Design an enzyme around this catalytic site. Sequence first.
Site, mmCIF file in Angstrom:
data_model
loop_
_atom_site.group_PDB
_atom_site.id
_atom_site.type_symbol
_atom_site.label_atom_id
_atom_site.label_comp_id
_atom_site.label_asym_id
_atom_site.label_seq_id
_atom_site.Cartn_x
_atom_site.Cartn_y
_atom_site.Cartn_z
ATOM 1 N N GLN A 1 5.289 11.534 7.165
ATOM 2 C CA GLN A 1 6.669 11.119 6.961
ATOM 3 C C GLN A 1 7.403 12.204 6.148
ATOM 4 O OE1 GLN A 1 5.978 7.402 4.774
ATOM 5 N NE2 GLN A 1 4.303 8.533 3.788
ATOM 6 N N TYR B 1 10.231 -4.948 -7.562
ATOM 7 C CA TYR B 1 9.453 -5.174 -6.339
ATOM 8 C C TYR B 1 7.986 -5.111 -6.771
ATOM 9 C CZ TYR B 1 7.523 -3.692 -1.717
ATOM 10 O OH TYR B 1 6.755 -3.493 -0.604
ATOM 11 N N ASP C 1 2.498 5.092 -4.609
ATOM 12 C CA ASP C 1 3.122 5.376 -5.899
ATOM 13 C C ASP C 1 2.391 4.807 -7.104
ATOM 14 O OD1 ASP C 1 4.387 2.531 -6.187
ATOM 15 O OD2 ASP C 1 4.977 3.235 -4.206
ATOM 16 N N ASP D 1 -5.467 5.402 6.856
ATOM 17 C CA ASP D 1 -4.662 4.419 7.527
ATOM 18 C C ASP D 1 -5.223 3.038 7.265
ATOM 19 O OD1 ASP D 1 -3.333 2.739 9.408
ATOM 20 O OD2 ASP D 1 -3.728 4.133 11.049
ATOM 21 N N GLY D 2 -4.362 2.164 6.733
ATOM 22 C CA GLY D 2 -4.790 0.789 6.473
ATOM 23 C C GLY D 2 -5.268 0.029 7.673
ATOM 24 N N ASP E 1 2.088 -3.201 0.866
ATOM 25 C CA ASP E 1 3.244 -2.490 0.315
ATOM 26 C C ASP E 1 3.512 -1.269 1.175
ATOM 27 O OD1 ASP E 1 5.173 -1.468 -1.211
ATOM 28 O OD2 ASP E 1 3.809 -0.533 -2.718
ATOM 29 N N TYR F 1 17.919 -1.231 -2.729
ATOM 30 C CA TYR F 1 17.511 -1.448 -1.352
ATOM 31 C C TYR F 1 18.739 -1.899 -0.582
ATOM 32 C CZ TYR F 1 12.361 -0.893 -2.435
ATOM 33 O OH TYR F 1 11.079 -0.463 -2.802
#
Lengths: 288, 273
Positions: free
Chosen positions: B31, B64, B89, B140-141, B159, B216
């Site tokens: 990304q 959040y 993060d 990758d989840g 998340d 957001y």
Amino acid sequence: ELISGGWFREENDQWPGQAMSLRVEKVLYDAPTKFQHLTIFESDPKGPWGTVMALDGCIQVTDYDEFVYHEVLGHTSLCSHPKPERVLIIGGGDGGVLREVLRHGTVEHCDLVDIDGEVMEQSKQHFPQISRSLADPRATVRVGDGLAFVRQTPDNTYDVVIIDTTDPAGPASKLFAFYKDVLRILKPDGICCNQGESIWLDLELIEKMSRFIRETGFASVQYALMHVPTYPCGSIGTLVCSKKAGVDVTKPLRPVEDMPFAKDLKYYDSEMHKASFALPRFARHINN
Amino acid sequence: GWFREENDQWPGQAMSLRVEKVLYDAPTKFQHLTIFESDPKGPWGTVMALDGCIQVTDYDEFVYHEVLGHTSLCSHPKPERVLIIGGGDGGVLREVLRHGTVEHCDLVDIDGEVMEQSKQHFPQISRSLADPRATVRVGDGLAFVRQTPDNTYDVVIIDTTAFYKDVLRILKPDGICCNQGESIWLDLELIEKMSRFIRETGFASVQYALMHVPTYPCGSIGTLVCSKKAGVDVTKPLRPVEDMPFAKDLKYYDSEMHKASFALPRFARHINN
Ligand SMILES: C[S@@H](CCCN)C[C@H]1O[C@@H](n2cnc3c(N)ncnc32)[C@H](O)[C@@H]1O
Ligand SMILES: C[S@@H](CCCN)C[C@H]1O[C@@H](n2cnc3c(N)ncnc32)[C@H](O)[C@@H]1O
Ligand SMILES: O=C(Oc1cccc2cccnc12)N1CCCCC1
């Protein structure tokens, strides 16, 4: 000087380095009024907002979300009053709070006083779903300063006073002697609610107002938070103030669910009413 | 010198922040990652965006992160093993690690550049990533859950920016899953579809918790809180945070806000009934 296909940009140097923007599909009004700059435009028809009104560059109402603030101010106040027969709205020239107040069968009469007659005129022309209320025989709609109007109102005139004003920086400045007048024109069971500002941008102003409304002589003051996407940082609140002691405004006295119009509302209900007085921990000291 | 966010699925609207200093701006294997210092006269502090969408700011990141971390763990009877999917993060992880019950948390974010940049530019958020109770994986989840045994986790927190069945499967019988749940203003049809899809895959209840997040789109976002075990009302806290020793360290979440978050505007209420 807005133009179709241009972008309306909202920046406030009180809040430096952030802006929000909407592309303009059609300009409907853009001119000085005797009191403020009034701008009305159709936003992008590929977006949800519909028609938008701004006063001195600040968005006041859009078609898509206007029901939030109008329902919260109108119902959180009247559902906290045992029998609200006579109502005063200060500001509210667009008609939205008044539409919500007139939903209530207990209301015999509502006075509305807004300083800018052009706001009413343009809301009739361009927001008919908001302004339909302004012509109700149950309403008396007057053009005038709210400050003068309450100073010349007798004691013990109103059950509910709703202060639906713009912000502290403009013609609404003294609306933030005024608060003692509001206390004085309220009847003993009187409820006042105001335009209460953001917990993100204005938290010190909210603390100061709440403290001094209590000191003025209101027995209780609770801030109700609500979600308004076109308002700065996405929320705003209202201070809901009881003249009488021992009143808990944070639980509805007269649940809207028992009134015939509950299902016509798009935001407010008794669960939202309760939920709106729960504040994020950093702001909870407003309410305790 | 402004960062402008406008999305192609919501046409004709934009949000902008003044850039004081560009800290990072590169595509990743996965990304586009942008990190900047925002106007020092405004409140936002340092800002991170992924594919052009704000993901974290110093000023509001606590909302959040507390809501995902605590709404889920406070709805679970004794959450000892937790999985975070995404979360590079470190914020959700920081909140999850507040809980004494937690023995172990795995965190799996596809993008190791995000963890790297978060350690460099968000130390208040990313300190958690080095905790002995955490294992941080780059991956990758989707593949991670496929390769995870049945009944491994008490809580899975998704998340993010076959899968849901894997999440159902890797959860213990009292398992809770919560996810990044989208906006009731902009994504209401997505939320209904996802709440239905999750219930269909076999979670017993799914309830959307709404929260206030100034940066957001339209100022709010939510999380679907999903219980594997039927008969679980996640809208009231099962283990109230006030009874734990870190309750007062939180800046947003408490039990009143937990209960409040499940109250939806009438127009959205069909999401929860
Ligand atoms: C448009 S309304 C706010 C939008 C949500 N209904 C705010 C109104 O306050 C009026 N206003 C501002 N100051 C005053 C005073 N002093 N008196 C009465 N009305 C006022 C102003 O003309 C707007 O129409
Ligand atoms: C930054 S975090 C959301 C911000 C609030 N903490 C979004 C993370 O989800 C990761 N992500 C996206 N897709 C996946 C998959 N498939 N697996 C794991 N992590 C993922 C992505 O790299 C972000 O760091
Ligand atoms: O409130 C924001 O934009 C706005 C949105 C809506 C109205 C506004 C009015 C003034 C300034 N800004 C406004 N933000 C804060 C979070 C980052 C994006 C910009």
